[PDB]
């Protein structure tokens, strides 16, 4: 069959019906019932006497006789009553006495006398809410009056009675809650429970009630106006006033009864408070140094200032996001950067959190001698007025007051008119922060005292169905940057020091190289260009130093003395970054701009057209084999970061694991490791595929370079350069490769020739080399020295010979695009880790270094042909 | 300052100490004080009456005179005492009184007597626990004895009063709770409430007992033994028993006041009820239609049956692991799989589950009036005896027992001797699991009753500080796979049909490109080769089909007719494709072998060495351009899946969105839509390629192979091949190319030719070439028609005249790695769709395809040209 029947809810069922509980449905009481307080049975109406009820919902209840109209408290019987009925039936009498019906032994009385309750005596006694019993009148009462009257001369406020003579908070207060921006509400919890806790705080000792104006200067935002006088104005008022009994511990803004709320009335105390040693813990990473997690605790105090309890913070309190129990208590541990977020709804804050409860957090550590101590920790408010100005939003960490207590909702201080009806403002506190600092030089984890800089936001309830609030938590490490600056500083002057003679070195040969003496406009301008690639290597060196140097001394470390640098750090890095790539970029750029207008010329016989055209297009072939097997680099540097797990090294934690199993915390990135992984895998692969590649192609498979060597050979040609305007490259002659330097005199020869006419003068010129080589020119043959060959110069000046340098090194393979390709394989590295910086992502990454490589390789070959057709024929 | 003192708890300090709130710091009582119950202050030593004791915790009392040495039961007087004194000297007396020591007024009586509550007459009375007022004495009791006193003729269990002489549950109870797998334990809480309520239940009507009896039916594990007599079988005996008043809506299994628990008590119930029809709903996903979420309620019960309220599963009701309200309320949403799992500690468990609630879920719709209805959801329990076999972990759906109620977590019905001491074992549910199923042949989203197949163990607590507990949960959707199966079989054998007719094609051409018309052995080889080739485009064809179709009719539609395939499905699907890889690499292995081991050789001067060494490396540097720029293809399919965000198309849930939020659920991958992506991507990147690529380069950057072609007129070269035995290419003679096909007598003569021996045999053959196209052989020219074309066959069988076919479409493309890229583009995807689906991960997948490229990249290029260095020349 199908098993369908109505939906039935208890609220629906009808005032004579009641709700069944094996059978989901709503059921007629039955004879002269009513449906009960909760709606769950039927408990029978007024007159009715109840015969027989057990645990069903089935009762019988009779008319009893009309002589005793009324019932007693309980329905099992009734009996006469001694003035008129009430609407329930229950035989009542006036405001100040007790029904009795009963006797001492609970036998019935029949007549239900109400007889009065002393109150006024040697024995104190006063009704109990249910017109029952009597019972004892309230303490203070009996004490300032003298039996529980409390009459004009005397005072009844918030529930006690406090005599006129003695000391009294006389004074209009101000019970006005201070909101968001410009808002104020008058809350009724202020109004009723303000100036009776401060005069039973002052008058007597009940301390619970010290507390609670603590309670009532913290749900207000601590703002002392100094002018004024409301919730906090009267907790420094009783302060300034219960001067006799002096101090609790030590501390000379702990008052004897009262709590700890402030730091001070002043604003000078945040240094002397947040830069005091004061504590002996050393904490550490892995080692034989068993301190790794901070022992935070919290004394919690409910509302009206009753101490529920110590604990620890572990497990997840004062972070009010949800999340497994092993994420929430390694948001606590030495070295993870704890960073979390998530969005609750307005239902489940008021549902979860119906009254606050205040926090006050302490460290915890051990003394000299065995015992155990506890520290305190400060909490800048940022909401805190203070003269109807923010102190502690500012930069000068000299204007911050510093308060004590914290709490995460408070759903009771911003009710209106009456204290049950439902909340028009609540505060909840959406951005919490715990910031630890080590002392500046250590050989241990000495810190200073943490800090809480928490901000409540006031968010208003309109629908409480809606609006979602955005609410956060963090922990972060720091440090004070003492050596970092000044040695990069020192490093980097030296090294661009040292860069200086780099660059004169390399322009003055370029000046040797050119048949110009004259330093006129271009040298300067060639220098400038020497000097930014020469320092593109300086900033480059330092940064991969620099992310290598945290990156080793961070992750493996015994007892903790460096903790990587926050935004600002890596901000300065990353600036000093940017440089490196845009100077690097300058360098390729004029360097494939030089390559690309060169004078290229092949003579037929050395030592037809379908012989040149064979040597032209090999040679047109292996100008951009770059000894590196690019693609395969890049896609290498991609795997090992993605799927391997080297990516793990630079998440800002303590452990230098790898493919974090995914019940653990996932800590954040640092773009200062993300750096140093990505430029070691770049260099550790492309130092591998040099001795490997260059190596095992040496020995065995093709070498494109020897190849066209000899492919000349084979077909008789030379081949003949001029790299920039005198100093050229071999000629196949005596095959061999060698160097050639030209003088002035034949550069003249050489360009009055640059003026039928392919061949016409293609022909003139191809009888003019193989004159000149075959021998008023009259060449020679020489040979470099060790001192020349690290200079890259030249001593000689070719004035009346043009020399000749024979160079078995293969020299005329630094114009093709693969005797430099140390700046290829460096300018492709910073190109990733550039595109890494902007957008986290490593896809993104190394799709964007793939595609660079592939526009730069087809511009070098086609304008690199297209110039080869017209320096040469067709 | 340094701000720090010892660590003090309230539970540390001394008997004479107390706790201070405000200095944290154990203080000393005073005189004749001690700690109070709480330890927050001090109430005073017996004998001593308390004077003065506002809200501080400084009170002062004084030892009031002897001659009175009791005190009140409040301690602001003392008096005299009847009997001796009490250890905290309070002036008891014996079991049955009440101790009168006020008045009716409240004035002291300074004689304290003690009288007797009646509890025996027309009112009835007994002391209420604090021994100061009667109190009414339990209804049972003053039913069936007169007036409670219950003596031996009665029965008093569980704190009741049964007459004997009716209806009873005699019989010997056995309180035996069912546990893991082989043990046993004598649990209190059945033991003391299972016979009472049993009782409660049948003689009164006493319905929260009734439930009280449900619930430990169901604390044990709903095990119907039928011979013995515990908890389940006492309910069934109640059940039998209570046939009077049948049935409460319409259904047989639920009597008139007990709760409904089973679905009955035989073994075929299951299909009847899990595929019945009866859900008007009609879900969907988008548009017009406004059911997207399914409305779950549930009736939550204590333990003792108190019926706590309705409420809707949504906000995290039965999934106990921690998650924002997003994913907890996005559980239930039609269409998302969801799949959680989390791990939660004992102690964590014990804190926030002190006692079990017991729910009963039902789904809610509406009917046809517009009155709202709910239906029964079935729980398979899968730890159920039912003669001591465990019933529903089976795979036979008719041996199935399905319940009805189910909880999370027992802390109570598995303790030992006492009631109140702490648990041995407790009992979580750690996997639940929630299957929605709709109606086969549909147009809109009619579903079955889903079903809830939660399984609980039994986990020991030994340390309760350790010992995680793994809890998951599920929502898994499903359907009936009727014509699927049946059009995939039919489709897929006519394609094979059809593909029966290719290769048998290419085999007869493969025969008549070969001298031997004779079927002997090669010809069967030769034919299975070609039939994987052709059928695994087949099985390729019928998976893309497939996936597509599953992505387009689910991820947009309007009112759900279809539903993702589950693991079942998916490895049906992964079993139908490894076999369209395995095929393919073997054609692709074959393909590369016959293009290896080629027949090729160069003529001189047909239309020296320095002139064919440079034509032959040109073609051996042609060999491997694909016409598709792999790299780049590969790179571009790894980006679209990862970084502009193509994968999230794959999540099974019911938006076809795009990168979505991380506030959002991100459900788990399809691996049967993870290869529909894949490969609809590759082959629309791989379509523009050639479009793009061919187009542009043939009007303006190179065409390699149209070089080639001109290469050998400008060098005067022609090239010579044979493909299999008998047919050939080009000759440049007339430069055109176009396809040969040699007479059987003509193969002879080149073959005896294969025995100083290079030049001396070169040139024998050399002369011979250009003999024979110069015109015994006598080739001729003809043409190839439009019907011969499309065969890749020929119809003239050449035995005289070695017929040669004119073909402008550079018909020698087909053996150089260009003109059969088809295969190329298909082997490189599946390649990527296998390693995609072995581990899910995507950059290891295309890190994989373009290793394997150059490997066979490489392979062609060694084996391909050391093989020509032995055809040709050294």
């Known amino acids: 069959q199908t098993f369908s029947f109505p939906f039935q809810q208890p609220e629906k069922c009808d005032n004579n019906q009641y709700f069944d509980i094996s059978a989901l449905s709503c059921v007629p009481c039955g004879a002269n019932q009513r449906q009960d307080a909760r709606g769950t049975s039927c408990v029978c109406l007024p007159g009715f006497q109840m015969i027989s009820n057990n645990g069903g919902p089935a009762i019988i209840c009779k008319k009893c006789p009309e002589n005793m109209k ?13 003035s008129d009925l009430t609407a329930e039936g229950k035989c009542h009498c006036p405001i100040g006495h007790i029904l009795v019906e009963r006797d001492i032994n609970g036998t019935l009385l029949s007549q239900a006398t109400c007889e009065l309750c002393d109150g006024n005596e040697n024995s104190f006694m006063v009704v109990n809410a249910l017109g029952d019993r009597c019972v004892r009148c309230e303490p203070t009462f009996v004490n300032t009056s003298r039996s529980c009257a409390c009459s004009e001369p005397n005072i009844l406020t918030g529930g006690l009675c406090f005599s006129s003579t003695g000391n009294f908070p006389l004074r209009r207060i101000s019970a006005a809650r201070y909101g968001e921006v410009g808002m104020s509400l008058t809350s009724e919890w202020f109004a009723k429970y303000l100036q009776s ?41 009783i302060f300034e006033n219960t001067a006799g009994l002096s101090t609790v511990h030590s501390i000379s803004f702990w008052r004897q009864n ?7 009335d002043q604003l000078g105390l945040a240094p002397q408070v947040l830069s005091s040693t004061s504590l002996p813990t050393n904490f550490s990473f892995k080692g034989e140094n068993q301190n790794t997690k901070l022992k935070f605790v919290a004394a919690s105090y409910d509302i009206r200032g009753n101490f529920l309890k110590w604990q620890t913070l572990e497990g997840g309190v004062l972070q009010l996001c949800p999340d497994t129990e092993t994420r929430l208590n390694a948001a606590y541990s ?36 065995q015992h155990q101590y506890i520290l305190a920790v400060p909490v800048l408010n940022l909401n805190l007025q203070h003269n109807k100005i923010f102190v502690n939003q500012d930069s000068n960490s000299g204007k911050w007051l510093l308060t004590r207590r914290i709490f995460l909702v408070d759903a009771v201080s911003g009710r209106e008119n ?118 593109a290597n300086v900033f480059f060196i330092i940064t991969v130093g620099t992310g290598l140097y945290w990156l080793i001394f961070f992750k493996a470390q015994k007892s903790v003395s460096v903790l990587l640098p926050m ?50 297009n090999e040679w047109n072939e292996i100008q951009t084999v770059r000894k590196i097997n690019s693609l395969f680099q890049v896609l290498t540097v991609l795997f090992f970061l993605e799927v391997v797990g080297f990516k793990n090294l630079a998440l800002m934690d303590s452990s230098s694991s790898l493919s974090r199993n995914p019940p653990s915390y996932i800590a954040p990135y ?57 100093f050229g490259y071999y000629i196949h002659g005596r095959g061999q490769t060698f160097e050639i330097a030209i003088s002035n005199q034949m550069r003249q020869h050489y360009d009055r020739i640059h003026e039928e006419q392919s061949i016409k003068a293609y022909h003139m010129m191809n009888k003019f080399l193989g004159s000149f080589i075959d021998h008023e020119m009259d060449y020679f043959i020489k040979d470099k020295l060790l001192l020349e060959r690290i200079l890259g110069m030249e001593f000689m000046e070719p004035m009346e010979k043009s020399i000749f340098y024979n160079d078995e090194g293969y ?64």
Chains 1, 2 share one sequence.
């Open 567 to 616: 935004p600002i750090q890596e901000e300065r890095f990353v600036t000093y970054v940017g440089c490196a790539f845009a100077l690097k970029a300058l360098q390729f750029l004029h360097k494939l701009i030089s390559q690309i207008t060169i004078d290229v010329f092949f003579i037929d016989w050395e030592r037809s057209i379908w012989r040149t055209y064979f040597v032209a």
């Open 70 to 82: 009324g019932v007693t408290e309980d329905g099992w019987n009734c009996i006469s009553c001694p």
């Open 418 to 535: 009456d204290l049950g009806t439902q909340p028009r403002v609540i505060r909840v506190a959406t951005q919490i922060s715990l910031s630890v600092h080590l002392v500046p030089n250590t050989i241990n984890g000495n810190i200073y005292p943490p800090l809480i800089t928490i901000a409540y936001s006031d968010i208003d309830i309109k629908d409480a169905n809606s609006q979602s609030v955005k609410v956060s938590f963090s922990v972060t490490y720091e440090m004070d940057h003492g050596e970092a600056h000044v040695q990069t500083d020192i490093a980097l002057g030296v090294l661009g020091g040292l860069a200086v003679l780099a660059s004169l070195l390399k322009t003055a040969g370029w000046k040797r190289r050119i048949g110009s003496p004259m330093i006129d406009l271009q040298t300067v301008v060639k220098f400038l260009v020497y000097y930014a690639g020469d320092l």
């Open 197 to 237: 806790s401060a005069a039973a705080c002052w008058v007597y000792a009940n301390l619970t009630s010290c507390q609670a104006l603590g309670n009532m200067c913290v749900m207000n935002m601590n703002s002392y106006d100094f002018a004024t006088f409301d919730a906090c104005g009267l907790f420094q008022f």
């Open 670 to 726: 640092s773009c200062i490791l993300r750096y140093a992984v990505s430029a070691a895998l770049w260099l550790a692969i492309g130092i591998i595929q040099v001795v490997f590649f260059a190596v095992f192609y040496e020995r065995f498979i093709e070498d494109k370079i020897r190849q066209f060597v000899d492919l000349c050979s084979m077909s008789n040609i030379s081949v003949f350069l001029l790299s920039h305007k005198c």
């Open 258 to 264: 009262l709590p700890w709320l402030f730091y001070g």
């Open 811 to 874: 020299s005329f393979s630094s114009v093709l695009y693969y005797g430099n390709e140390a700046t290829l394989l460096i300018f492709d590295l910073l190109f990733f880790c550039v595109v890494d910086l902007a957008c986290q992502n490593f896809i993104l990454a190394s799709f964007l270094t793939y595609l660079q490589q592939e526009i730069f390789r087809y511009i070098r070959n086609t304008v690199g042909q297209k110039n080869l057709a017209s320096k040469t024929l067709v």
């Open 334 to 369: 030495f070295g993870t950067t704890y960073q979390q977020n998530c969005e609750i709804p307005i239902s489940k804050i008021l549902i979860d959190f119906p009254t606050p409860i205040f926090y006050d957090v302490y460290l915890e550590y051990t003394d000299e001698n």
